[PDB]
């Protein structure tokens, strides 16, 4: 037999015994549909936060927003999505505009590379120009 691969790789007198019945006479108090749906929703894994990490060629996967502003942006996005989860336009649980002053919290973004510099230009471009500086040709 074989098992399909999920992700891409580099290939790209017997008698009915007494006491047996299929009838049901009991219904669950907690329930079996509601609890099963709640557990199904809770079983999902945690989102892979891939921003700020290198890609195969070296460029940093991400967006160019400032770190603090971009963290505040995702906080506001989570606040928005909580309302959609709770069915109401407004939200009671808020991950934004809480009383605590967090002007120092930071989230990973594509603005910064791995060495402390800035990804204004992606690394591949940077190495390309650095190598294109020293080159030579055949004499005329």
Partner 1 sequence: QCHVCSAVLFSPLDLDAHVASHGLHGHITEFISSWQNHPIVQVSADVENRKTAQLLHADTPRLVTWDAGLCTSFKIVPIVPAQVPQDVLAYTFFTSSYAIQSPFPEAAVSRIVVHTRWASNVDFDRDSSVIMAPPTENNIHLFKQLLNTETLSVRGANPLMFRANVLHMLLEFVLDNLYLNRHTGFSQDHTPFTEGANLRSLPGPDAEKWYSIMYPTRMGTPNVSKICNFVASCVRNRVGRFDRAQMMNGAMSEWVDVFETSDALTVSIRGRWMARLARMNINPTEIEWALTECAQGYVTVTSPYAPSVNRLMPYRISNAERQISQIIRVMNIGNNATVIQPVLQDISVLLQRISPLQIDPTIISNTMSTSPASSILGKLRPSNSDFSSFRVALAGWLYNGVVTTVIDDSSYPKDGGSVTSLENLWDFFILALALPLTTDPCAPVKAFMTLANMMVGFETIPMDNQIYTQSRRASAFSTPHTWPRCFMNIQLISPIDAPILRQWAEIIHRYWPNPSQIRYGTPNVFGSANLFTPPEVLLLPIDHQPANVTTPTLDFTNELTNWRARVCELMKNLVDNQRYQPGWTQSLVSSMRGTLGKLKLIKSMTPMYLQQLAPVELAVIAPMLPFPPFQVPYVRLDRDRVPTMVGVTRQSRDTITQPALSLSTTNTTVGVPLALDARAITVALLSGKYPPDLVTNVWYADAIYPMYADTEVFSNLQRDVITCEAVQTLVTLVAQISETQYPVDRYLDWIPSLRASAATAATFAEWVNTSMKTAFDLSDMLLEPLLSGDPRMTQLAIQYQQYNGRTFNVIPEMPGSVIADCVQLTAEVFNHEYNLFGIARGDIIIGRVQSTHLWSPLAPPPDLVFDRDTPGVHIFGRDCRISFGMNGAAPMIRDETGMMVPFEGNWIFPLALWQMNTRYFNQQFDAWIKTGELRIRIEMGAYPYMLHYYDPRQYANAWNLTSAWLEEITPTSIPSVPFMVPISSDHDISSAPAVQYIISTEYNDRSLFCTNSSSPQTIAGPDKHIPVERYNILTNPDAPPTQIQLPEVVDLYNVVTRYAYETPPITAVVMGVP
Kindly tell me which of 63 and 105 has the beta carbon lying closer to partner 1.
105
Over the window 84 to 103, marking each residue x when it contacts partner 1 by CB under 8 A and - when it does not, the resulting string is -xx-x---xxxxxxxxxxxx
Q: What are the structure tokens assigned to 117, written together?
A: 């510099």
Q: Which of 15, 57, 89, 140 binds partner 1 (CB under 8 A)?
A: 57
Q: Which of 18, 89, 138, 140 binds partner 1 (CB under 8 A)?
A: 138
Q: Which of 13, 15, 18, 45 binds partner 1 (CB under 8 A)?
A: 45
SS3 79: helix
- Least gap, CB of 94 to partner 1 (angstroms): 4
Residues ≥6 apart with Cβ < 8 Å to 89? 83
Print burial letters for 30-56: b (CB count within 10 Å at least 16), e (below 16).
Answer: eeeeeeeeeeeeeeeeeeeeebbeeee
Over the window 106 to 125, marking each residue x when it contacts partner 1 by CB under 8 A and - when it does not, the resulting string is xxx--xxxxxxxx-xx-xx-
Q: Residue 93: beta bridge partners?
A: none
The C-alpha atoms of residue 8 and residue 4 are separated, in whole angstroms, by 11
SS3 16: coil
Residues that contact partner 1, how many (by CB under 8 A): 99
Q: According to the binding rule CB under 8 A, does residue 64 interact with partner 1?
A: no
Over the window 5 to 44, marking each residue x when it contacts partner 1 by CB under 8 A and - when it does not, the resulting string is xxxxxxx--x--x--x-x-x-x-xxxxx-xxx-xxxxxxx
């Amino acid at each position: 037999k074989r098992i399909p691969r999920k992700t891409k790789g580099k290939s790209s007198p017997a008698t009915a015994e007494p006491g047996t019945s299929n009838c049901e006479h009991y219904k669950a108090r907690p329930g079996i549909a509601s609890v099963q749906k709640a557990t199904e929703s809770a079983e999902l894994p945690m989102k892979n936060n891939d921003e700020g990490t290198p890609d195969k060629r070296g460029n940093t996967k991400g967006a160019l927003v400032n770190e603090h502003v971009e963290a505040r942006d995702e906080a506001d996005d989570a606040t928005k999505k909580q309302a959609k989860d709770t069915e109401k336009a407004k939200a009671q649980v808020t991950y934004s505009d809480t009383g605590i002053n967090n002007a120092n919290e930071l989230s990973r973004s594509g603005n910064v590379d791995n060495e402390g510099g800035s990804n204004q230009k992606p690394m591949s471009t940077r190495i390309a120009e650095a190598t294109s500086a020293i080159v030579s040709k055949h004499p005329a």
